[PDB]
Ligand binder design. Structure first.
Ligand code: 06P
Ligand code: NAG
Ligand code: NA
Ligand code: NA
Lengths: 28, 251, 12
């Protein structure tokens, strides 16, 4: 789907979940 | 999930529960990849050493769930299976090589705040993100310990492990269709999938386009969260040609 | 065992 992987309650409203930053920080 | 935490509402809207009809019980996790297709581990459906061989009518899928046991009225949706497809070279005899299966739903599921598909990786996203040290996220309603069960969906973030370390942690033969993840004994932090998390997704959020991709499927492990052991995951990208062939051929 | 019953429609 064109909209795959974008969560209605997070990405769709530009809200971050409590630990996604942990993932981003590992992508060095 | 061992040493994880409660998921936030709508944190994993592609999460699917494979549910046995009789007796009514959790069978496995799975993931929603479109309005009619669900991805899971082959061993969730077929594993002769444990006398497991499910047919379509044995099972339901429950989508949009948070609570493990409650019927989540007005939130979750329950779908019947039209057809199961297991990888033709799934190796249940030896090491769960190619541990992957698709399930086509009888009718499309409506997307909502709580129900939404995850992306499957392209070659470039896989190459970019499937690197030792990079963390993904595993979710499930499985056991909280090796030797009990959660009230709601559990989540844990775990780092991908270097292939030689994966290999050296086990006597089981590892293949290119698998990768492993988890913390080393010296890293302090811990966490792992466990019994009942089988079939659930290992996901990563691409920093390039800010979308979640399913890189892995919970496949196997010796015990749960043991020091010096790691969780093993089906390598979704390596098997994507099969996925696409099934979807293209069968809708 | 400890699962809330689901609506009968889904079990038909
Ligand atoms: C850490 N961890 C991750 C996933 C699971 C769920 N998977 C399982 O329980 C799978 C199903 C068959 C046996 N199994 C296992 O994980 C076995 N313990 C190890 C095994 C691997 C490959 C072939 C035979 C046996 C269990 C534990
Ligand atoms: C599993 O079930 C199918 C059909 O019900 C059967 O044909 C098959 O021989 C069984 N065992 C397998 C696939 O190992
Ligand atoms: Na080894
Ligand atoms: Na471990």
């Amino acid at each position: 789907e064109a909209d795959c992987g974008l969560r209605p309650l997070f990405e769709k409203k530009s809200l971050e979940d409590k630990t996604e930053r942990e993932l981003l920080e590992s992508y060095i | 999930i061992v040493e994880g935490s409660d998921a936030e509402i709508g944190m994993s809207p592609w999460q699917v529960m494979l549910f046995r009809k009789s007796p009514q019980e959790l069978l496995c996790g799975a993931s929603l990849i479109s309005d009619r297709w669900v991805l899971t581990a082959a061993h969730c459906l077929l594993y002769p050493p444990w006398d497991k061989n499910f047919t379509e009518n044995d099972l339901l899928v429950r989508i949009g769930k948070h609570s493990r046991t409650r019927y989540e009225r007005n939130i979750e949706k329950i779908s019947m299976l039209e057809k199961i497809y297991i990888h033709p070279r799934y190796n249940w005899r030896e090491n769960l090589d190619r541990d992957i299966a698709l399930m086509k739903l009888k009718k499309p599921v409506a997307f909502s705040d709580y129900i939404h598909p995850v992306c499957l990786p392209d070659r470039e996203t896989a190459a970019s993100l499937l690197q030792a040290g990079y963390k993904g996220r595993v979710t499930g309603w499985g056991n909280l310990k090796e030797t009990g069960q959660p009230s709601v969906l559990q989540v844990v973030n775990l780092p991908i492990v270097e292939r030689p370390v994966c290999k050296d942690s086990t006597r089981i033969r590892i293949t290119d269709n698998m990768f492993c993840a988890g913390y080393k004994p010296d890293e302090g932090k811990r966490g792992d999938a466990c019994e009942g998390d089988s079939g659930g997704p290992f996901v990563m959020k691409s920093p390039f386009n800010n979308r979640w991709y399913q890189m892995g499927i919970v496949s196997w492990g010796e015990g749960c969260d043991r020091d010096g052991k790691y969780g093993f995951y089906t390598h979704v990208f390596r098997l994507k040609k099969w996925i696409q062939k099934v979807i293209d051929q069968f809708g | 065992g400890d699962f809330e019953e689901i609506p009968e429609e889904y079990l038909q």
